[PDB]
Amino acid sequence: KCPLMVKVLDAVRGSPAINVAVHVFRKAADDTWEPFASGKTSESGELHGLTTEEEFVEGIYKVEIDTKSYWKALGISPFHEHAEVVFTANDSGPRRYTIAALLSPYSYSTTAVVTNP
Amino acid sequence: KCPLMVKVLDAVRGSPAINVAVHVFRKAADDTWEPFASGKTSESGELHGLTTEEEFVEGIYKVEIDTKSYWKALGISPFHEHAEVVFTANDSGPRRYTIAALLSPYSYSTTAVVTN
Amino acid sequence: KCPLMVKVLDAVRGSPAINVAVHVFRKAADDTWEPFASGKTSESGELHGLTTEEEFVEGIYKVEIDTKSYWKALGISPFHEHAEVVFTANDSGPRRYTIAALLSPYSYSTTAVVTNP
Amino acid sequence: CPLMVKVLDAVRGSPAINVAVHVFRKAADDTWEPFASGKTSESGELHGLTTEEEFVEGIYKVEIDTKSYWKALGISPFHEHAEVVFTANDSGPRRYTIAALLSPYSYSTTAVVTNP
């Protein structure tokens, strides 16, 4: 039951994306993004246990997905260098966040699911 | 000016979809779909002049987009045979309806723009 | 699990849509749709037990998700009566098909995830 | 216009209005600096953000201030903004269109790239 989840899906072949790097940052006092967590997308196209419950604190976060390398490996030239999602976390209180990303060579869509523990 | 507007975009090549057949149906009292309008998407990727405002009477309509034939010509196996959008129209007076489709071999997205 | 499952998410509330009725049809030899399966989305907006491998055979199938009833309960006027997905299935042996739906009062998006079991 | 930003609303089925958009370019030292800024019009579209000569090869970031749009309309949003990062004019002169479909807890982006 990790607090933050990231899901990546491929729309060209209708499969979860594999071997995709994901980076997470936290906004600092100097308005500078400092690294928070990182991971590699599995064959199932899902990440879990990136950040612990205690580590996840109030603030502004950025979840980055490196789509460019994934399409380079498959042999399709992509448009986006990366997809990044910026959101305020736990402003009202502790919550569970899910970030879903549907990927295409020239497009991508993202949604958020927020649930009360 | 057109009461009903349908535009289709391709996600793989970052271009509007070309040579995609579109069919429009209207539900009758017998709960069946009879043809209402048909057309082919232009190179720009949208479908102008499907119906006139007077002919576009109040009721329940359906817009169908032929995804499979578009992918077959390119050489990619498509998951979907067609994409269909059903919507009640002119519920309270005439309006302007816009249907947008973003196509992928295994996914598509649809949004509606309604204005007075 | 099941050869065909349907996941429905709500974009307005950032939650999975609940109490959403789903109906499945199969195209006959005379090109007429017949009732094939039915169900309702759970609190997680997901469908299970909708069809089995023996019954689910090669052909053309249609999945209908009733969106109007969901929005009337919330009190928002919906644009779409329902969202329907039509797909040729089991072209080469049994498979696993995933239909995901992201709903909005005036928009919806769908994707297909096909895997070889 | 080499760069255009289309923003739509999914809740009301109308183009988004009063949304701040800012454009940046990555510098030699990997820093973002302002490139252009504007607001969405009645039709939710942007024009004249940059010209052909000024738009140069590199990495650009397009930001869409969705948070203020939902706060004004009375609903608490999830995302502060929607950011799109891409390489432009790598192979030569091209036309880039950025379309964003906004929702309180979701958004979708597509890019249309054409050769003039």
Swiss-Prot record, chains A, C:
Modification sites for Phosphoserine: 44
Biological role stated in the UniProt entry: Thyroid hormone-binding protein. Probably transports thyroxine from the bloodstream to the brain.
Protein name as annotated: Transthyretin
Associated disease: Amyloidosis, hereditary systemic 1: A form of hereditary systemic amyloidosis, a disorder characterized by amyloid deposition in multiple tissues resulting in a wide clinical spectrum. AMYLD1 is an autosomal dominant form due to transthyretin amyloid deposition. Protein fibrils can form in different tissues leading to amyloid polyneuropathies, amyloidotic cardiomyopathy, carpal tunnel syndrome, systemic senile amyloidosis. The disease includes leptomeningeal amyloidosis that is characterized by primary involvement of the central nervous system.
Other remarks in the entry: Tetramer dissociation and partial unfolding leads to the formation of aggregates and amyloid fibrils. Small molecules that occupy at least one of the thyroid hormone binding sites stabilize the tetramer, and thereby stabilize the native state and protect against misfolding and the formation of amyloid fibrils.
Consequence when changing residue 39 to A: In AMYLD1; amyloid polyneuropathy
Shown segment, full-protein numbering: 29 to 145 of 147
Family the UniProt entry places it in: Belongs to the transthyretin family.
Source organism per UniProt: Homo sapiens
An example Gene Ontology CC term for this record: extracellular exosome
Glycosylated residues (UniProt): 90
Subunit structure, as described in the record: Homotetramer. Dimer of dimers. In the homotetramer, subunits assemble around a central channel that can accommodate two ligand molecules. Interacts with RBP4.
Curated annotation (Swiss-Prot), chain B:
Phenotype for residue 83 to S: In AMYLD1; amyloid polyneuropathy
The protein, known as: Transthyretin
Keywords: Amyloid, Amyloidosis, Cytoplasm, Disease variant, Gamma-carboxyglutamic acid, Glycoprotein, Hormone, Neuropathy, Phosphoprotein, Secreted, Signal, Sulfation, Thyroid hormone, Transport
GO cellular component: azurophil granule lumen; extracellular exosome; extracellular region; extracellular space; protein-containing complex
First and last residues shown, out of full length: 29 to 144 of 147
Organism (species): Homo sapiens
Outcome of substituting residue 42 to R: In AMYLD1; amyloid polyneuropathy
Note: Tetramer dissociation and partial unfolding leads to the formation of aggregates and amyloid fibrils. Small molecules that occupy at least one of the thyroid hormone binding sites stabilize the tetramer, and thereby stabilize the native state and protect against misfolding and the formation of amyloid fibrils. Two binding sites for thyroxine are located in the channel. Less than 1% of plasma prealbumin molecules are normally involved in thyroxine transport. L-thyroxine binds to the transthyretin by an order of magnitude stronger than does the triiodo-L-thyronine. Thyroxine-binding globulin is the major carrier protein for thyroid hormones in man.
Effect of residue 22 to M: In AMYLD1; amyloid polyneuropathy; by far the most frequent mutation
Family named by the database record: Belongs to the transthyretin family.
Maturation and modification: Not glycosylated under normal conditions. Following unfolding, caused for example by variant AMYLD1 'Gly-38', the cryptic Asn-90 site is exposed and glycosylated by STT3B-containing OST complex, leading to its degradation by the ER-associated degradation (ERAD) pathway.
